[PDB]
Amino acid sequence: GMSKIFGIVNITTDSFSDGGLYLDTDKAIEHALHLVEDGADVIDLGAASSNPDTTEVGVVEEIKRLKPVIKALKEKGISISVDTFKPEVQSFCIEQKVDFINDIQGFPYPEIYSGLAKSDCKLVLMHSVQRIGAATKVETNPAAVFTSMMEFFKERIAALVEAGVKRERIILDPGMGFFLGSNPETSILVLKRFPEIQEAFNLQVMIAVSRKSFLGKITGTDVKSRLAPTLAAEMYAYKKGADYLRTHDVKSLSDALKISKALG
Amino acid sequence: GMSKIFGIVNITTDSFSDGGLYLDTDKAIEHALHLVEDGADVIDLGAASSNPDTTEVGVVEEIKRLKPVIKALKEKGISISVDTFKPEVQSFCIEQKVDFINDIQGFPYPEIYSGLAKSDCKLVLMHSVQRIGAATKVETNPAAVFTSMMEFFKERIAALVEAGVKRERIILDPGMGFFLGSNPETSILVLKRFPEIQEAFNLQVMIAVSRKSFLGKITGTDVKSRLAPTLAAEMYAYKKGADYLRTHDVKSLSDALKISKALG
Ligand SMILES: C=C1CN=c2nc(N)[nH]c(=O)c2=N1
Ligand SMILES: C=C1CN=c2nc(N)[nH]c(=O)c2=N1
Ligand SMILES: Nc1ccc(C(=O)O)cc1
Ligand SMILES: Nc1ccc(C(=O)O)cc1
Ligand SMILES: [Cl-]
Ligand SMILES: [Cl-]
Ligand SMILES: [Cl-]
Ligand SMILES: [Cl-]
Ligand SMILES: [Cl-]
Ligand SMILES: [Cl-]
Ligand SMILES: [Cl-]
Ligand SMILES: [Cl-]
Ligand SMILES: [Cl-]
Ligand SMILES: [Cl-]
Ligand SMILES: [Mg+2]
Ligand SMILES: [Mg+2]
């Protein structure tokens, strides 16, 4: 199987790798259209970041950013994912009939589970060692993190299914980078063992490594020179059977996947 | 095993990807020093190109370009390879005591074999469908090219060994891109089957794909946007056990190899 590409379109001011570049509505639409041209299957819209240096974005402001971009992309028939962890914003996305809701908190509020069940959109259920809120910088034990993540998925999937969410709507994301720990060994272990998530839960898995900190620690590179380590980790994940890849440089990943497919 | 990196330093005017950038002596030395900083094990110096659009460079001019660069790099203890197919230039490299002579013609002139035997430098024996001269654009049958290449290596190795060249000095390069054919299928087959060269001859193999045309035909990219397809093919070759990789972007390849090593 070939991994599907989520194209990151950050409509923020403080995204760790491209904050402020696509804050304007038309520039965000133009960026999304370019990523689709580059081979993106889904456009992941994020009007609020979640890196350790992020600043809280209000719900009204977040919906204001997403509203005209969703409208323009839905007009073109583009599959839309929204990277939001705020239940009121997620409820707005259900009304807009987007294809995915991408929650770094993994839908931890059962009060809205009945509303999620009535929708038909797919749910990207992400695990993090923080569980609630944006990423932080904390050292973790890789084996213990993988074990707790496996238990977290099992309980959260069961809670959503018990509330009426169809199981096949759930896509699992183990988290990566600071969502797993400040030491890169935890991210490395998850990258090596994520097929065990597909096997245990029989659900698709998304891998999101693009430009993240742990790549820079292994190679000694800042965020602007992280294309090569990103591509190395993304094609490792593709070769290992990742169902979705969430990336910034869609064109480079697509070209790299075309070469890997021709050689494999 | 980890592939060794040959850093390309073109002291030419018409190299297909970076011609004219490092024609100046000090700029070529500065580029070579940067590539060593980026992780290059060997610096491959080429004062004359061999792409299909190349222009013949005189022997006197070629030696004039290489002479001060070799001197500066030898002062720093840098391992030097010289990409030259002219016997008089190769004789100059033997006098300079460089570590490698990289011949796209695979040393086809037995008149100089006795001189090659007395030297201690390693010999990069490259195969091409043209055999003599620079690359051309010609469509070829992949299976027939691989078969003829295997026979070419067998006869050329035996001729060099019979003349006194120690067998362990020979590094095999199957050729790539236009050296194999204008259709990318021939390059793809050689990339998939080059371990058979190591097995049959018990010699090291060099893979040189960086920015070459066949990558652009598979992905639909010009020479300036070929980093991602280059990295995809280079780490495929590394994972398959290539002993040497000849590349332009040493820093990107090194960073990519560090990630692949940490994940493998
Ligand atoms: C930087 C971020 C923001 N949103 C994400 N969303 C998902 N699903 N996975 C990530 O790793 C992730 N990284
Ligand atoms: C573009 C070039 C010039 N010199 C080379 N040298 C070797 N050994 N192999 C190549 O593929 C090669 N490509
Ligand atoms: N949202 C996130 C953005 C970046 C990182 C990281 O660099 O590890 C983690 C989370
Ligand atoms: N010397 C060479 C340079 C480039 C190519 C190629 O693009 O195929 C082939 C030979
Ligand atoms: Cl960007
Ligand atoms: Cl709701
Ligand atoms: Cl800590
Ligand atoms: Cl739960
Ligand atoms: Cl850097
Ligand atoms: Cl360059
Ligand atoms: Cl000689
Ligand atoms: Cl032809
Ligand atoms: Cl011969
Ligand atoms: Cl292009
Ligand atoms: Mg974001
Ligand atoms: Mg050259």
Residue numbers in the entry:
A (entry chain A), B (entry chain A): 0 to 263
Give sentences copied directly from the paper behind this entry.
DHPS catalyzes the condensation of para-aminobenzoic acid (pABA) and 6-hydroxymethyl-7,8-dihydropterin pyrophosphate (DHPP), producing 7,8-dihydropteroic acid (7,8-DHP); this compound is further transformed, ultimately leading to tetrahydrofolate, an essential precursor for DNA and RNA synthesis. All three Sul enzymes adopted the (ɑ/β)8 TIM barrel fold also shared by DHPS.
The Sul3·DHP+·Mg2+·pABA complex structure also featured a well-defined active site. This Sul complex structure contained electron density corresponding to DHP+21, pABA, Mg2+ and PPi. Multiple electron density features verify this trapped molecule is DHP+, including a clear break between its C9 position and the p-amino group of pABA, and a ring pucker around atoms C6, C7 and N8 consistent with saturation at the C7 position. The position of DHP+ in the Sul3·DHP+·pABA·Mg2+·PPi complex superimposed with its position in the YpDHPS transition state complex structure 21 and the pterin ring in the Sul2·7,8-DHP·Mg2+·PPi complex. The sidechain of this residue in the Sul enzyme structures was localized near the carboxylic acid group of pABA and occupied a spatial location that would clash with the sulfonamide group and its N-acylation (i.e., the azole group of SMX) as revealed in the YpDHPS·DHPP·SMX complex structure.
